[PDB]
């Protein structure tokens, strides 16, 4: 191969590793913001499901 | 037994552990480890023995005992919480009662002290379904409950567990405490990550399955329970001693093959927490298990131990054991490293 | 690097799918002819590295040691078939199958682009250099020699498998061309220390590095002659390979952190050299050699410059060649003779005349004669190591000095005086054995007319 | 659960009596109905790392 | 002096040796239901008044 | 830490969405590694049981392959939806957290000082 | 918490201790699981009275009922046990030792 | 017999060769996967060539 | 130990030594008795004076080291004016092994105890400096 194939074959290898060690460092940030704030669809442990509650009046008035 | 009520008893044990991943609900939970040991204790005493009958029996107190603390944390979770969703618990009591109640029921260490005596008074199949089947339930709700678990105490439960499995089987020559002292040291690295990724005690739990599987069935296929039956193999069925020593290595996590996975991908996220000293030593004290593995794989495979005249006798007949799924449990043992990202289905 | 790659993975089907009778013909032929094709890596650039895909590459530093390594294998098989040839069929081609996922595994260790794939496969290479050691060692001491090859190797790979992580995690990246644009200076912290040692102890230990050593004198001893070829020429460089990629990121940490190790080296080149003067066992004196001569890799390769590190590449490959032979000369006496004692036969020059030149020419070589590259790579490291520091070429003469007499040591006592009374099952060296002798001989020599292209990439 | 077979198979094993909030026979309420609805709503949806 | 013996004493040796003594101290066990389940109360018993971990 | 995920169809293989995403080439590398070990589990088969390797039974040996391969198309399948998942809560959570992840302000290196460690 | 929940802890925590601290009839030890769910029933039946949780009043039947199986469970390997060695002594099972 | 038994001889001396050729295959196939940058690096950037259409293949 | 910890890291290096010792001593003998528990627990003393001699031996031996280390650590930092200094805990290190050779009465284990003690109590106060976690809280 000549230098030119070479020489740009590496420049599309640089890319796509730039891109992926970038996306690798964006997600380790993302993953501490998500478990230390608990405001993303990861580490979203589940609460109660609020539709087993029942609305009818009950048998007594006070509740 | 009749092969009917055989195979009722192992659909039982199935249907608790079933009832126990399904449940929403701690009484639900409760009762699928009750039906799970009802239906167990007959196949571990099926062979009507003084060593089966005593096996069964220090595994019903150990399993009973931590039956009733589990029940314990459940009702005291309830006192502090008024409802019974299978969660995190609401009391930290109740958190260390049930995280010891599934140490006691996994086996891990220092509530270790059944494992090695139980499998070895049982048939290796009985074996089989205690240290790989029994490992499902008490994970799924390891896996549920995590977020409220002691740190401490989890991953000083995990140390003592590599420690102690890989000390415990250096010194022995029967397979089925081997494969004990093994369970043990495996079972640490799957609640060592649980706090920090729960999806990769997942991991770890599958592929230890079915290498534990491959182990079993190859003992079973030629009736091996100590060292020195197993040196007989190479005289009998050469290919089988290949096979051993692949599954070995695998299980002593040395690369390429599938059983450095796991321990390849523990350490990845113990380290993106900043857990640089524990998963080093976690990483060097496994060593000791690679060496009674390699012990093995010296009496079978790599040497040639003596043999016995009668011997000549077996080479006349066929294995006719059933080896179930054994062709395909090998290579999912050893060759699935290239695959490793499809460990993103269990997320 | 899959026109490589591919070529070897066949070998098997080759090997298994052969007529019972030319498994050696087909797999000598076959390996030979992939030797030929890795010539086509030497298309190397004066700035950029021939750099194939997002796994694999190669630079002036990798393709050398590739083309060695499958130069390897062919002299491995022919090596090897004299002393299985009683070994029944299915065993024979299982062990040329460890033989052929050896060369796999290291041509693929050589190119790798990213780190944690380099690991992967160094670790890699342990399995079947294990499996070749008990299995097919003839003494005793094989299964004690195998578990002090393993865990003296597993002790320090496991805390570099940490710290790659842990540089992945923080850099973003281990692709080693990424690396090398992206990397930050190392501050000087205590946690830095175990870092450094964390990185550099696994690549310390496969050196050997002295006092870490002791793994190589049985493991080197107890092989079959084939295991032996291998764990010296190629295996002991995977070492010398890591260090060299791995201190791009430790720097500047490397200037104090060296210390303790070049001392260690300084000195253990002088201590094995003189181990060799007195001992008794041809092979174990052989194995205690590699250990002199890598200890120069050592400290040539911590020193960090262009002139020790074209060094430590010409030593790399001149000890390469040189130790497989002298291991493949030394077996040839024990086919005879069933011995590894040195003292045991003797006067073998008036036996063998053509197998005594071989042993002078080998002997030459390893005591650095020069214009051998033996002697080039030697001296490039010299000359390094005294501007580092004047003092050090009173050590490196010393050794120079001690190495000339154990090579001719070894040379007079097996060679010289007169021949043994009572052997007299000596008969007349075959064909493939002066063959064998030959095959590494030769390339060692030609390469004195084009040193370049064993000098690295700081040329 | 571990598997959600409930949710997917729209089936309700044992989620009738998980909390004392839930549909009670004969409409008998718990004595702290009113504080167990209040902190579900509350809770509800926006997992318990915000909850807590 | 060194190659054949301290360097053989100071690492592999010692740290071989060092795991057979502790491999034989968890292996050498009475097989008692008894004295188990009796170190089962210690852990419990440590695991509160000293390490806390109910809290 | 997916587990919760706001559009998780619980208990589901293959969600709807899923199928906006293109499908693994019946050319994928990983595919045919797949097949190749279900190849490798028919050959041991044979071994184990002492049949001619390479030719007894290739009824067999077919359906080693295809149950491999049928089986590990539906993994890839999922494998790369869990990573396509993943992928788009990030950027979702980048874009509505931009406080946390601001553009630098990033300078050429005649600018930025880095000190200089000769190698003497 | 009110000053019941004192008493029935403590029978809980002196049947856990009495269970971990064997003498030698494993016939004591089984009657100290039994007081262990005892007192797991009461504490339950408690809780859930005061509270007036409706449908949690089946649960201390399951309790008990299941729990009562497994006794019949550890009273037929008690008896195999005695078969075997003619006393229920838990000294006599240690041959796992080895 | 010729032809046959011949080849039953000696066909396994295909093997290498024709994984040779494959892997030199799949090495070009690799290549136009990194095309990014051909003809758009600074340093060799250019018009093509009349009847030329890529710089490299 | 969550509070004797801390008692023992709230003393500044190489003062109050007499405090920062009763902290260590507590430290080793609290180690002595739980190590006494589980092997009067395992292994069924003779008689009970047999027990509470081996429990007051093993806790003795513990508490002794635990001492040594303890003194002879604040007493280095204090003599070389060094609090921040690994080299400190190094030494005491080593002495509380030497202790451990002399109660065993073996010089080898003196001696193995001494180099792998001293590495470790030194590894300690590096971990202390440099804020290395062992129990690592998660964090992503
Ligand atoms: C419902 C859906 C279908 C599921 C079926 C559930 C099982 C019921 C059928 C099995 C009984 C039967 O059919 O024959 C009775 C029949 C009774 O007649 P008998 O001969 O007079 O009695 C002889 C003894 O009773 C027994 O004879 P033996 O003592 O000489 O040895 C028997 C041995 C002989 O079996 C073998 O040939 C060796 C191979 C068995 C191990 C391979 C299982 C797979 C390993 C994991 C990989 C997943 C697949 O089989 C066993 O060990 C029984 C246990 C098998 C399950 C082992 C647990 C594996 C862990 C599963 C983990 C899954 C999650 C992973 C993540 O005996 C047998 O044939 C037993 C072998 C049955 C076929 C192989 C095992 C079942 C297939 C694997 C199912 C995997 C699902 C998990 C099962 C969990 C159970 C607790
Ligand atoms: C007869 C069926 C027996 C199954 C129960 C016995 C085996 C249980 C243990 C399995 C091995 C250990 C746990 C493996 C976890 C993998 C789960 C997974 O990722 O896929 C679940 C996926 C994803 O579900 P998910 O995304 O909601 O979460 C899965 C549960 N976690 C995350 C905790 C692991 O669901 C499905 O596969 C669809 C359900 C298909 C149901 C078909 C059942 C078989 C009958 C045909
Ligand atoms: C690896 C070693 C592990 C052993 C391999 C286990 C093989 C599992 C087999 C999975 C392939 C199933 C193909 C079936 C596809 C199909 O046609 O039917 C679909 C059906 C579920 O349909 P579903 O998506 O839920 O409903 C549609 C509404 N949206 O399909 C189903 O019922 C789903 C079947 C359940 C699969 C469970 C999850 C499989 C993952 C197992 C663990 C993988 C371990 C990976 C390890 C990583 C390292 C390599
Ligand atoms: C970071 C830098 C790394 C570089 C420095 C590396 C230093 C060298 C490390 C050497 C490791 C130990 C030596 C390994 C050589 C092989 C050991 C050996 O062969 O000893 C033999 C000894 C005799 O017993 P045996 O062989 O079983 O009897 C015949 C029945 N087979 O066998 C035995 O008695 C049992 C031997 C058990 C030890 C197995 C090796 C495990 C090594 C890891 C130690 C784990 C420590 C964990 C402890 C944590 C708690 C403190
Ligand atoms: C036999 C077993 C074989 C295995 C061998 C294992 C070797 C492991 C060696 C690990 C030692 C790593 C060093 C850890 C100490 C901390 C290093 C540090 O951070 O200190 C910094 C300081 C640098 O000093 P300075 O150069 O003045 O600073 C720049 C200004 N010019 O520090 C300095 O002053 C630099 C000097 C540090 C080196 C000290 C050398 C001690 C003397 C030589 C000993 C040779 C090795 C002895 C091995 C015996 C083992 C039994
Ligand atoms: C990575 C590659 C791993 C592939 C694993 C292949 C599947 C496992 C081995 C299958 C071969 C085997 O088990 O038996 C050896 C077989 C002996 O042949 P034979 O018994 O005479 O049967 C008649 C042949 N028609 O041998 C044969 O003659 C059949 C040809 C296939 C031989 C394969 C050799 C396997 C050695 C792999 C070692 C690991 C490689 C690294
Ligand atoms: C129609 C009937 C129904 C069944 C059809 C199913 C067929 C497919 C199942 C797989 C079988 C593949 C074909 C196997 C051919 C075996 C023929 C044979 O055994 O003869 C031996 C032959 C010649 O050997 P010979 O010269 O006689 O003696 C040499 C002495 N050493 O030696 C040979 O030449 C054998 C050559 C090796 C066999 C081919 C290897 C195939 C590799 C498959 C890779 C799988 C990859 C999957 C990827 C899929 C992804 C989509
Ligand atoms: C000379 C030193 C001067 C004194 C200072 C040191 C003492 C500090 C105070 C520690 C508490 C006393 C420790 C004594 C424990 C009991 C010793 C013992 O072995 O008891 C005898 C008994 C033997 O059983 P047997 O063979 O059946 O003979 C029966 C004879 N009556 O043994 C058994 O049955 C074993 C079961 C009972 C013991 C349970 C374990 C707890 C005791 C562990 C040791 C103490 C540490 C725990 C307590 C710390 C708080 C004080
Ligand atoms: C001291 C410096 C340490 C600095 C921090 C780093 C901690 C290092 C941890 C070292 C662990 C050492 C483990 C040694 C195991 C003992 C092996 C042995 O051989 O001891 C035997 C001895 C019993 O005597 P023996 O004859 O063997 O058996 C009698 C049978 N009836 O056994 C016994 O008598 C009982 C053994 C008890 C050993 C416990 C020692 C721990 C002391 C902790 C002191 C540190 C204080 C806290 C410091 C905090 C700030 C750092
Ligand atoms: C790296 C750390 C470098 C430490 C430097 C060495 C320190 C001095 C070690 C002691 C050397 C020694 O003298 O051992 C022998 C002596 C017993 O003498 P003896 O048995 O009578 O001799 C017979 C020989 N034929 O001594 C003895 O009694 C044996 C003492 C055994 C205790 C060894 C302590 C090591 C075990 C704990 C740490 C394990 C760490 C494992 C690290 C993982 C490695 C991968
Ligand atoms: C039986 C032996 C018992 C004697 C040991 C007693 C425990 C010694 C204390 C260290 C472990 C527990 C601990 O308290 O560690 C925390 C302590 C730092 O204390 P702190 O006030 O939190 O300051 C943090 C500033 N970064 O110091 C630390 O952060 C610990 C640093 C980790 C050191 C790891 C040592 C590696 C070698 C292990 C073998």
Redesign the pocket.
């Given at each position: 191969d000549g230098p030119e194939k070479n020489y740009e074959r590496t420049m599309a290898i640089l890319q796509i590793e730039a891109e992926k060690a970038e996306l690798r460092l964006k997600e380790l940030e993302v993953r501490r913001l998500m478990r230390a704030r608990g405001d993303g669809p990861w580490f979203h442990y589940p609460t109660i499901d609020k539709e087993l509650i029942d609305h009818s009046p009950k048998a007594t008035p006070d509740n | 037994m009749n092969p009917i009520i055989f195979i009722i008893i192992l659909l039982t044990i199935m249907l608790g552990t079933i009832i126990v991943m399904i449940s929403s609900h701690w009484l639900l939970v409760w009762i699928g480890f009750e039906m799970n040991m009802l239906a167990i204790i007959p196949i571990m005493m099926k062979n009507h023995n003084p060593r089966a009958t005593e096996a069964s029996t220090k595994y019903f107190l150990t399993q009973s005992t931590a039956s009733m603390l589990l029940m314990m944390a459940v009702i005291i979770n309830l006192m502090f919480s008024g409802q019974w969703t299978v969660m995190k618990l609401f009391n930290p009591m109740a958190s260390m009662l049930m995280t010891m109640a599934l140490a006691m029921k996994l086996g891990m260490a220092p509530f270790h002290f059944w494992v090695p005596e139980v499998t070895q008074g049982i048939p290796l199949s009985s074996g089989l379904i205690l240290l790989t089947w029994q490992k499902l339930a008490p994970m799924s709700v390891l896996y549920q409950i995590f977020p409220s678990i002691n740190l401490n105490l989890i991953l000083t439960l995990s140390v003592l567990s590599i420690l102690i499995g890989g000390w415990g089987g250096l010194n022995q020559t029967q397979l089925r405490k081997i494969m004990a002292y093994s369970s043990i040291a495996h079972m640490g690295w799957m609640t060592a990550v649980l706090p920090y990724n729960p999806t990769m005690t997942?991991?770890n739990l599958?592929?230890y399955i079915?290498m534990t599987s491959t182990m079993f069935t190859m003992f079973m296929a030629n009736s091996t329970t100590t060292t020195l039956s197993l040196s007989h193999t190479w005289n009998k069925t050469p290919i089988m001693t290949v096979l051993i020593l692949a599954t070995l290595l695998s299980m002593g996590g040395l690369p390429p093959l599938?059983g450095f996975?796991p321990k390849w991908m523990i350490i990845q996220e113990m380290t993106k927490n900043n857990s640089i000293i524990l998963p080093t030593f976690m990483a060097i004290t496994a060593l000791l298990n690679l060496y009674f593995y390699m012990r093995l794989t010296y009496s079978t495979t790599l040497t040639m131990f003596p043999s016995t005249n009668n011997m000549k006798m077996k080479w006349q007949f066929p294995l006719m054991k059933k080896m179930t799924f054994l062709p395909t449990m090998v290579v999912?043992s050893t060759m699935?490293?290239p695959?490793?990202?499809?460990?993103?289905?269990?997320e | 690097m899959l026109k490589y790659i591919i070529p070897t993975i066949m070998l098997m089907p080759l090997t298994w799918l052969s007529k019972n009778n030319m498994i050696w013909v087909n797999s000598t032929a076959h390996s030979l002819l992939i030797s030929f094709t890795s010539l086509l890596l030497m298309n190397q650039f004066g700035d950029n590295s021939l750099n194939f895909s997002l796994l694999f590459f190669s630079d002036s530093l990798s393709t050398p040691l590739l083309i060695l390594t499958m130069w390897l294998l062919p002299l491995m098989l022919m090596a090897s078939q004299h002393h299985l040839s009683k070994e029944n069929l299915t065993r024979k081609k299982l062990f040329i199958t460890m033989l052929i996922s050896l060369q796999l595994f290291l041509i693929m260790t050589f190119t790798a682009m990213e780190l944690i794939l380099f690991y992967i496969l160094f670790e890699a290479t342990l399995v079947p250099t294990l499996i070749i050691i008990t299995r097919w060692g003839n003494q005793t001491e094989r299964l004690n020699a195998g578990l002090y090859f393993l865990f003296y190797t597993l002790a320090g790979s496991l805390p570099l498998l940490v710290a790659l992580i842990y540089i992945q995690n923080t850099v973003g990246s281990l692709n080693f061309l990424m690396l090398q644009y992206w990397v930050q200076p190392v501050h000087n912290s205590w946690s830095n220390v175990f870092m450094w040692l964390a990185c550099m102890m696994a690549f310390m230990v496969k050196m050997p590095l002295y006092g870490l050593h002791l793994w190589l004198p049985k493991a080197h001893v107890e092989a079959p002659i084939a295991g032996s070829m291998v764990l010296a020429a190629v295996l002991l460089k995977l070492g010398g390979y890591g260090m060299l990629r791995i201190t791009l990121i430790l720097n500047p940490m490397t200037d104090f952190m060296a210390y303790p190790f070049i001392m260690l080296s300084l000195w253990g080149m002088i201590m094995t050299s003189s181990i060799c003067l007195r001992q008794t066992d041809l092979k174990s004196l052989i194995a205690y050699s590699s250990v002199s001569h890598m200890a120069l890799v050592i400290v040539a390769i911590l020193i960090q410059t262009p002139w020790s590190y074209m060094g430590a590449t010409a030593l790399m490959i001149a000890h390469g060649l040189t130790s497989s032979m002298l291991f493949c000369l030394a077996n040839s006496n024990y086919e005879r003779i069933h011995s590894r004692t040195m003292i045991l036969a003797r006067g073998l020059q008036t036996l063998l005349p053509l197998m005594a030149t071989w042993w002078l020419l080998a002997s030459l070589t390893n005591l650095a004669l020069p214009p051998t590259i033996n002697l080039i790579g030697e001296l490039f490291v010299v000359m390094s190591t005294f501007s580092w520091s004047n003092i050090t070429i009173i050590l490196m003469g010393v050794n120079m000095v001690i190495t000339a007499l154990y090579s001719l040591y070894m040379l007079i006592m097996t060679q010289r005086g007169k021949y043994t009374y009572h052997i007299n099952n000596i008969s007349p060296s075959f064909t493939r054995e002066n063959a064998l002798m030959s095959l590494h001989i030769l390339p060692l020599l030609l390469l004195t007319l084009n040193p370049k292209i064993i000098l690295g990439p700081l040329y | 659960p571990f598997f959600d077979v409930q949710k997917?198979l729209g089936v309700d094993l044992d989620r009738w009596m998980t909390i004392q909030s839930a549909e009670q026979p004969h409409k008998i309420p718990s004595r702290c109905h009113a504080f167990e609805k209040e902190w579900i709503e509350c809770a509800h949806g926006i997992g318990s790392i915000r909850a807590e | 002096l060194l190659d054949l013996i301290w360097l053989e004493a100071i690492l592999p040796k010692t740290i071989s040796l060092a795991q057979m003594k502790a491999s034989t101290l968890v292996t050498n066990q009475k097989g008692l239901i008894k004295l188990y389940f009796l170190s089962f109360l210690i852990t419990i018993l440590i695991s509160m008044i000293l390490f806390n971990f109910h809290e | 830490m997916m587990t919760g995920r706001q559009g998780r169809?619980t208990?589901?293989?293959?969600?709807?969405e899923?199928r906006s995403l293109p499908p693994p080439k019946l050319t994928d590398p990983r595919l045919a590694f797949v097949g190749f070990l279900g190849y490798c589990s028919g050959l041991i088969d044979n071994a184990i049981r002492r049949r001619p390797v390479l030719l007894a039974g290739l009824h067999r040996q077919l359906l080693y392959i295809t149950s491999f391969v049928?089986?590990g198309?539906?993994?890839l399948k999922?494998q790369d939806y869990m990573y396509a998942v993943r992928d788009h809560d990030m950027f979702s959570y980048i874009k509505s957290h931009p406080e946390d992840f601001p553009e630098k302000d990033k300078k050429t290196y005649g600018e930025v000082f880095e000190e200089f460690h000769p190698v003497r | 918490m009110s000053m019941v929940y004192m008493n029935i802890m403590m029978a809980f925590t002196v049947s856990l201790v009495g269970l971990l601290m064997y003498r030698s009839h494993l016939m004591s030890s089984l009657l100290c699981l039994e007081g262990m769910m005892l007192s797991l029933f009461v504490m339950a039946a408690l809780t859930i009275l005061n509270s007036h949780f409706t449908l949690a009043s089946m649960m201390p039947i399951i309790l008990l009922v299941f729990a009562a199986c497994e006794a019949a469970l550890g009273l037929s390997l008690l008896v195999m046990v005695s078969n075997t060695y003619g006393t229920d002594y838990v000294q006599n099972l240690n041959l796992l030792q080895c | 017999m010729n032809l046959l038994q011949v080849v039953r001889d000696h066909w396994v001396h295909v093997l290498v060769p024709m994984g040779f050729v494959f892997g030199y295959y799949l090495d070009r196939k690799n290549d136009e996967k990194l095309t990014a940058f051909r003809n758009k690096s600074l340093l060799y950037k250019r018009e093509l060539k009349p009847n030329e259409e890529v710089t490299w293949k | 130990a969550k509070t004797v910890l801390r008692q023992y890291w709230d003393i500044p290096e190489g003062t109050e030594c007499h405090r920062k010792t009763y902290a260590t001593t507590s430290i080793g003998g609290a180690a002595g008795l739980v190590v006494s528990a589980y092997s009067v627990a395992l292994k069924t003393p003779t008689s009970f004076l047999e027990g509470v001699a081996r429990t007051g031996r093993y806790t003795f031996t513990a508490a002794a080291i635990g001492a040594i280390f303890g003194l002879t650590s604040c007493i280095s930092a204090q003599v070389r004016e060094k609090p921040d200094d690994p080299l400190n805990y190094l030494i005491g290190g080593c002495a509380g092994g030497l202790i451990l050779g002399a109660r065993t009465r073996s010089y080898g284990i003196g001696a193995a105890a001494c180099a792998y003690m001293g590495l470790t109590a030194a590894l300690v106060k590096m971990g202390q400096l440099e804020g290395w976690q062992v129990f690592a809280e998660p964090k992503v």
């Open positions: - | 997942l991991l599958i592929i079915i599938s996975m999912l699935m490293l695959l490793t990202p499809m460990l993103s289905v269990l | - | 997917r | - | 169809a208990f589901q293989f293959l969600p709807d899923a049928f089986v198309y539906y993994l999922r | - | - | -």
